Amino acid sequence: SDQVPVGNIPRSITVLVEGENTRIAQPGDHVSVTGIFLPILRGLLSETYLEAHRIVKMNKSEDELRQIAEEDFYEKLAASIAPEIYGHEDVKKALLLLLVGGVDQSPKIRGNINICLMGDPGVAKSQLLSYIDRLAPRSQYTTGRGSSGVGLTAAVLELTLEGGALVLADQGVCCIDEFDKMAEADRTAIHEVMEQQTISIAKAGILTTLNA
Amino acid sequence: VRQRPDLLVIWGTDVNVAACKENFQRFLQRFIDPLAKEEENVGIDITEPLYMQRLGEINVIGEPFLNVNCEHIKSFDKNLYRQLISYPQEVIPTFDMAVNEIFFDRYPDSILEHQIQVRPFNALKTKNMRNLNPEDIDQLITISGMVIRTSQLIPEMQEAFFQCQVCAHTTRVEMDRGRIAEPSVCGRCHTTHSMALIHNRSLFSDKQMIKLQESPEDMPAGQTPHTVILFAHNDLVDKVQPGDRVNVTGIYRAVPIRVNPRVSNVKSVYKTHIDVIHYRKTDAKRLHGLDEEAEQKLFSEKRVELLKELSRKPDIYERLASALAPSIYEHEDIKKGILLQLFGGTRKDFSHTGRGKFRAEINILLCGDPGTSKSQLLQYVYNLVPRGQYTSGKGSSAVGLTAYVMKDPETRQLVLQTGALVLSDNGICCIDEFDKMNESTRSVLHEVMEQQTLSIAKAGIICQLNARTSVLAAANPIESQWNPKKTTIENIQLPHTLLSRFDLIFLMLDPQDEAYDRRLAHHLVALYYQLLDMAVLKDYIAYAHSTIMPRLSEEASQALIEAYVDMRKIGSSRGMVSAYPRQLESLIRLAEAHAKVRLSNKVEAIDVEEAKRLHREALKQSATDPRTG
Amino acid sequence: EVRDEVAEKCQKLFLDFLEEFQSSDGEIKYLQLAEELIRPERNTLVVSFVDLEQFNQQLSTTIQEEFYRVYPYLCRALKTFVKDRKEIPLAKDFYVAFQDLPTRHKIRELTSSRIGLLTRISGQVVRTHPVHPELVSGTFLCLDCQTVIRDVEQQFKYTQPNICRNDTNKSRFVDFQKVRIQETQAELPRGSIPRSLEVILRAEAVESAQAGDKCDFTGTLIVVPDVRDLSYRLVFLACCVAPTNPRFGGQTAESIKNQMTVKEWEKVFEMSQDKNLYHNLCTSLFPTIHGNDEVKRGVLLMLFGGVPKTTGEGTSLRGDINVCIVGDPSTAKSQFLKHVEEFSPRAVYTSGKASSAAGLTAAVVRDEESHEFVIEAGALMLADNGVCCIDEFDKMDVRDQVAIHEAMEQQTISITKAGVKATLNARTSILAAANPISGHYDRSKSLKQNINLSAPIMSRFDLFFILVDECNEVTDYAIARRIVDLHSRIEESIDRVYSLDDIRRYLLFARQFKPKISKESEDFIVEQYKHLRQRDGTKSSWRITVRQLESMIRLSEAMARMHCCDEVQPKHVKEAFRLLNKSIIRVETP
DNA sequence: TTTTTTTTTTTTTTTTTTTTTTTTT
DNA sequence: AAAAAAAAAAAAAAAAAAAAAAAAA
Numbered sequence A: 001s002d003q004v005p006v007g008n009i010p011r012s013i014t015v016l017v018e019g020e021n022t023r024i025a026q027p028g029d030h031v032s033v034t035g036i037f038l039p040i041l042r043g044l045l046s047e048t049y050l051e052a053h054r055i056v057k058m059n060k061s062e063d064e065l066r067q068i069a070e071e072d073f074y075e076k077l078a079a080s081i082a083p084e085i086y087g088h089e090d091v092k093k094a095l096l097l098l099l100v101g102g103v104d105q106s107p108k109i110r111g112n113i114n115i116c117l118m119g120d121p122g123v124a125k126s127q128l129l130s131y132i133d134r135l136a137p138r139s140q141y142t143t144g145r146g147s148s149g150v151g152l153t154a155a156v157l158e159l160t161l162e163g164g165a166l167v168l169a170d171q172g173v174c175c176i177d178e179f180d181k182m183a184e185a186d187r188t189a190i191h192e193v194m195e196q197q198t199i200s201i202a203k204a205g206i207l208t209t210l211n212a
Numbered sequence B: 001v002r003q004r005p006d007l008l009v010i011w012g013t014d015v016n017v018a019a020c021k022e023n024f025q026r027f028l029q030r031f032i033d034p035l036a037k038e039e040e041n042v043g044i045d046i047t048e049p050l051y052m053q054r055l056g057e058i059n060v061i062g063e064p065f066l067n068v069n070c071e072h073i074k075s076f077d078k079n080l081y082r083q084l085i086s087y088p089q090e091v092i093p094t095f096d097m098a099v100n101e102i103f104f105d106r107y108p109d110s111i112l113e114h115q116i117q118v119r120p121f122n123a124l125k126t127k128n129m130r131n132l133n134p135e136d137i138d139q140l141i142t143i144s145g146m147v148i149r150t151s152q153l154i155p156e157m158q159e160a161f162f163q164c165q166v167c168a169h170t171t172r173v174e175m176d177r178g179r180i181a182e183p184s185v186c187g188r189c190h191t192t193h194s195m196a197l198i199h200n201r202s203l204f205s206d207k208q209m210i211k212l213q214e215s216p217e218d219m220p221a222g223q224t225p226h227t228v229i230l231f232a233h234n235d236l237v238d239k240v241q242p243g244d245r246v247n248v249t250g251i252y253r254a255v256p257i258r259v260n261p262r263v264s265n266v267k268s269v270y271k272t273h274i275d276v277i278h279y280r281k282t283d284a285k286r287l288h289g290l291d292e293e294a295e296q297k298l299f300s301e302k303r304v305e306l307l308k309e310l311s312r313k314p315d316i317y318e319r320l321a322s323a324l325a326p327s328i329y330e331h332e333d334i335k336k337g338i339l340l341q342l343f344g345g346t347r348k349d350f351s352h353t354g355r356g357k358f359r360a361e362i363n364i365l366l367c368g369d370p371g372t373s374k375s376q377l378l379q380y381v382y383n384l385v386p387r388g389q390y391t392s393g394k395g396s397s398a399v400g401l402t403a404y405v406m407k408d409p410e411t412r413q414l415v416l417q418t419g420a421l422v423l424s425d426n427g428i429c430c431i432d433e434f435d436k437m438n439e440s441t442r443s444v445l446h447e448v449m450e451q452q453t454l455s456i457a458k459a460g461i462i463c464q465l466n467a468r469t470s471v472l473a474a475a476n477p478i479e480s481q482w483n484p485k486k487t488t489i490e491n492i493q494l495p496h497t498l499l500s501r502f503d504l505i506f507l508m509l510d511p512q513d514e515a516y517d518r519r520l521a522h523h524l525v526a527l528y529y530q531l532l533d534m535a536v537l538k539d540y541i542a543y544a545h546s547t548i549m550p551r552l553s554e555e556a557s558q559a560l561i562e563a564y565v566d567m568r569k570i571g572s573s574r575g576m577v578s579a580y581p582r583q584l585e586s587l588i589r590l591a592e593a594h595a596k597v598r599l600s601n602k603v604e605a606i607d608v609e610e611a612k613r614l615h616r617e618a619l620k621q622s623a624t625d626p627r628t629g
Numbered sequence C: 001e002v003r004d005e006v007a008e009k010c011q012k013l014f015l016d017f018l019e020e021f022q023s024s025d026g027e028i029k030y031l032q033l034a035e036e037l038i039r040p041e042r043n044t045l046v047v048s049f050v051d052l053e054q055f056n057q058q059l060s061t062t063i064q065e066e067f068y069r070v071y072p073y074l075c076r077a078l079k080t081f082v083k084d085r086k087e088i089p090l091a092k093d094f095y096v097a098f099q100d101l102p103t104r105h106k107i108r109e110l111t112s113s114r115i116g117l118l119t120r121i122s123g124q125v126v127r128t129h130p131v132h133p134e135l136v137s138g139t140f141l142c143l144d145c146q147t148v149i150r151d152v153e154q155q156f157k158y159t160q161p162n163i164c165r166n167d168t169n170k171s172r173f174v175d176f177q178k179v180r181i182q183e184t185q186a187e188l189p190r191g192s193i194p195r196s197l198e199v200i201l202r203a204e205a206v207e208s209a210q211a212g213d214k215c216d217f218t219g220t221l222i223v224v225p226d227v228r229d230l231s232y233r234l235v236f237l238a239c240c241v242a243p244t245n246p247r248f249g250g251q252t253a254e255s256i257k258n259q260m261t262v263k264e265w266e267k268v269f270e271m272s273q274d275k276n277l278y279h280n281l282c283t284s285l286f287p288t289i290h291g292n293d294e295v296k297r298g299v300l301l302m303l304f305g306g307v308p309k310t311t312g313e314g315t316s317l318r319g320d321i322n323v324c325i326v327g328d329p330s331t332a333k334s335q336f337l338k339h340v341e342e343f344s345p346r347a348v349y350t351s352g353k354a355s356s357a358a359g360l361t362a363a364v365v366r367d368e369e370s371h372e373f374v375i376e377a378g379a380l381m382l383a384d385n386g387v388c389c390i391d392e393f394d395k396m397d398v399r400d401q402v403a404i405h406e407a408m409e410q411q412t413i414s415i416t417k418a419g420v421k422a423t424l425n426a427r428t429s430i431l432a433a434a435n436p437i438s439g440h441y442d443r444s445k446s447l448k449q450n451i452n453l454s455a456p457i458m459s460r461f462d463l464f465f466i467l468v469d470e471c472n473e474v475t476d477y478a479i480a481r482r483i484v485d486l487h488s489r490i491e492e493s494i495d496r497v498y499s500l501d502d503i504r505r506y507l508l509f510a511r512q513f514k515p516k517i518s519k520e521s522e523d524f525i526v527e528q529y530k531h532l533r534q535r536d537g538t539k540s541s542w543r544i545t546v547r548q549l550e551s552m553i554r555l556s557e558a559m560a561r562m563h564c565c566d567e568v569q570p571k572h573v574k575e576a577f578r579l580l581n582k583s584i585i586r587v588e589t590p
Numbered sequence D: 001t002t003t004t005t006t007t008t009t010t011t012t013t014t015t016t017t018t019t020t021t022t023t024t025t
Numbered sequence E: 001a002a003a004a005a006a007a008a009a010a011a012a013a014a015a016a017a018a019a020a021a022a023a024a025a
């Protein structure tokens, strides 16, 4: 989004990975790819694509001890979460745990932590939600009804299955803003995720049980 | 010798036919599983070689199949296992020759329609197919999944019967390598191009296409479910219905696809599919399916006597109830209800009565606040029984829960596909968050709960799909909390007609009890750091389904009548769930279910009393009052 | 010219059987059957496979295991059997129809091993395509040498001669109809959709199957092709079609009478003279339903129905009575609907929201084999001259309720879709089951308020039956006793004076009667209608209008039809008036 | 070389389902 | 404020009319 022209929309390009360049990138992964811009023959108009040669996962998708052993190291990470956001010392310490998450036990109880920041307008709720997105390894930030319905869950698109923010955020942190003003069906879908950690769909063209 | 479409080095390999043949014969003649458990292998004289007894069974029954466990070969000889897995095409014919030689050396006078063909199974499980590689092409693999759909029979030619247009001379050409060599010149009168192929006089085998959903135990982050295509050939057609959970062992086939269904040009990219070699319906983490119950030879006499002895213990019911979901604490009544649901009532035939089908399953609605361990029970039962399904309210629709129509993107034909409810025909449908369900999709459940059928009438086809499902629904109180100020029926927030369908509405409330809180905290903490085994409960349920067919008795009938009258009097209040005639039927089922637990084969006073007690304990009728609340 | 010795021997033995087999009387029965083969529109001889087994067991076995490769030879044997006896046209062809095959196979059992050999199956007809002329063997002209390649046999595909040896007027055609069937409910395996294989019918038996009928097809499974690719599809070729459960062992009253056997007519006539046949029919048709005598009587009169009539101006007088059932849950409404469906032939049952408009009324598709279009019959159509049981009527969408109202109004469905228009007939009575609004019937309101049916829908319902669940202890005890007796003794405990088959035959016979209305009955009707209108002068559950006079006339007609009477006596009018009066319920209020 | 049947592509419309929105208690 | 019914979106399927290319003789 930082490099799209002011009045334009992001442009998409095709990449044909092969050999040992497969199963390296999943949907939603920020990737720098070095390949060859080659056309596929169809005047002699020709489509294009990138023949992948080197795939690297960047930023959050990217893939000393003395300070970690410190007593206050717990506070330091907390104080380092969105430092420009003054105060909220306790909240950041709670979000820190959300990033770390509990530990799954299978005697199957989930090990995730769900934190809802409810408050009055202009108390930097969104900024923290936006900050977590730029920090968590796998994350998705959906706001209100802009990305609703199939935006969260999956859809059928041969017919393949495409996951929504939850699926892309699977084993990650899905930052939901304005949860209260979310579509009632979407809230129901989340209810399953925060307890079942799955998305059971039985629509017309879809009958699966996703893993979120 | 029925040809199988599924199927010095020969060429570019590491196998010589004689070596594999002799090694397989040896393995078949001198293999004993040391850790074999008598129950694990029923009706087999363990001390003697296993597969020779298998051959004896084949001689007796006549089934010309030998289910060979690939793990047995792996243990006995790893090199032969490598050869088999790497080159299933060449190895399996060698095994067929070996087993035929062994079984005609002994029993030289046995009669079979064709020769005996081996079926390797339980090959090293491929956790996730996506992890498969082009290096794994044309190799035996075993996967586990659920069958979404099965297509109708497709006849595939094996021998072409040609006749001369002039002299009518008949010859049978045989498929060579996927092609038939048209003679192009008659052998009788020598006329050119006078041989025409005749379809109906030719020889055909079967081929069934099965679209199967895999349940890969290795689920990388963000990976969507995966569906694959299987081909079943000449005996495995319609061996698995939609909804069945299977372990499929077969050859990983990749075939060319033509850019159009008419031009000979093919995409550089292939698309892969499995040729089924063996189906395994057994799973140690679930109960026995209906097919396993159907076949009689599943319970060794010792195991049958063990189950009989278990049934004679007074605490059989409570021991069985305590077995379900050991990680859930002191839900004795709920677990008893789920046990009665698993056992199910008698399946009766009412065609002669002119009454129609009668529902013999049991539907349990757990109404409770979100905090209570509701969804855990539903997920456990969904992860316990076969032919089970799960739904989460707003995530489903009526058409998707009943049936729909779609263009199969491998034959490009508009075909009808079943829904979630049908897939669990003879299983259990766990409907979670039942309250958060629009009335449109809810309306469907009425027929599935009373009639057990689903009569669709749409442009595509008009027909009624039979669905004998048992519904395990979970609902939250209106306002997400069971406020004691509102009456029971008001708090449930469901139409009275629908609540009448359910035969057990368990109210999961939170009694502010210190002892219960302390014990539950102890239990949960113990779980965080951590009986009657599955192998015995599973067998008990399978046997009870197979043999026990309880029939009502005089005293049971009288007690049921009196109990129904008492229920009608009790539920006649304003806020309590009113009692209808449909509830009497419910009691019957429950009673029968309990009578099925004791293997009584006849419902008597105790069973009806237990059914009435369980129903009254549900709805907390004792803890309620005429001033409902 | 190689001779198929097996086929020739089969032909010889079959001809010997045809010219030698004798019935019980000792006469050559098949000679008598062939006697009718001379007349045009008659080119098929029905031969019972039981006779074939009795005469020559080896021949029957050979035919069963080699049906397809010998059927042409059986046809040739029949042609020789008939030609030498009479002066049939030389070009006329003849076909052999087998029936009474002892064993039946399931649609799931039609494996490739059954290809090209005799088999009988049972199924439900989904739809029948039109009838076409089919080319079996004609003439071909080479455009390179004008050498006429003659009598090339077509195998379900336009098959030109493969190589030159070097028209229509001179060809032989046979009737051909591709009718699609589907698997029966009993045969359906757990959790699987029904299977459909398009069976193909030929001369004579080219329209014996209609959409919605349960039929047994006897014939052969075959493969049809759909460098070259051999893509084959299974298809059934049937040489005979018969009902799966024949109504009569042997359309106007006398024709139906002769259609029956001697014993069936004895039974029908005996019950026609059976005084109190009304109560006997009520009990026998609903043995497991306690009480609710009024609803049973209503559905019985519905099964019989009135007498349709046409006005001089062309107005159509509805002659089929509809019924609706409304009340508290667990009042055995859906049980009444299921009883009517399972009993009455041509009875189709549906649900509230499970049926769309097209599948509930009709649809159109284009024939895959010609330029014409075929009509997929919806639920309403399959109930033609029958009954449609709509359970949970109140839940039905308005887009569909409009269609149901149209069907009740003018009995017809008008379609303008997919390049074709059509006005099709739907002479169906409607048995609806509607839940009261709020899920319980409120006695302090008119019927209009207790249910969510639109006024037009209710207007044309002849009978409304209210089933309130009064919490009476005696009724509860009786209901419990009956239900427990049912569930204790399943097969027995049902002593119905007349078997459902006997009642079906009696209904089919009685439906043909068209009772008159004598002057005495007319005066009695006038007085009864006067009194019934005076009833509305406390309040009733719904007003009484002239439509109630129409309902009373129709109910009297149905009552007359029940006893197979020819004139509506005053007693029938009295009974109809009493039943309709009981159907009206007072709106009690504090 | 010259025909022919197919192949596509390019528009357009139609039908089912789902989702979104509007009205009522 | 929440549920029921209606309307619109949108996606998939069908007709089809016409221009171009590959296979056949």
Ligand SMILES: Nc1ncnc2c1ncn2[C@@H]1O[C@H](COP(=O)(O)OP(=O)(O)O)[C@@H](O)[C@H]1O
Residues within 6 Å of the ligand: A084, A085, A086, A087, A088, A119, A120, A121, A122, A123, A124, A125, A126, A127, A128
């Ligand atoms: N505690 C805080 N410290 C620093 N900035 C804040 C704080 N609270 C609010 N803001 C400022 O308010 C602006 C909008 O905040 P926003 O995240 O939209 O509030 P909310 O989402 O809670 O309504 C941000 O630019 C942020 O810089």
Ligand SMILES: Nc1ncnc2c1ncn2[C@@H]1O[C@H](COP(=O)(O)OP(=O)(O)O)[C@@H](O)[C@H]1O
Residues within 6 Å of the ligand: B450, B581, B582, C288, C289, C290, C291, C292, C328, C329, C330, C331, C332, C333, C334, C335, C336, C479, C482, C483
């Ligand atoms: N009067 C009665 N006699 C016999 N059985 C009855 C009677 N009333 C109710 N029942 C039983 O109650 C059960 C449920 O009735 P049902 O028809 O499903 O209710 P609804 O009319 O609401 O659909 C039926 O199986 C039926 O056997």
Ligand SMILES: [Mg+2]
Residues within 6 Å of the ligand: A125, A126
């Ligand atoms: Mg905000």
Ligand SMILES: [Mg+2]
Residues within 6 Å of the ligand: C333, C334, C392
């Ligand atoms: Mg009902």
Ligand SMILES: [Zn+2]
Residues within 6 Å of the ligand: B164, B165, B166, B167, B168, B169, B186, B187, B188, B189, B190, B191, B194
């Ligand atoms: Zn020849």
Ligand SMILES: [Zn+2]
Residues within 6 Å of the ligand: C142, C143, C144, C145, C146, C147, C164, C165, C166
């Ligand atoms: Zn020629």
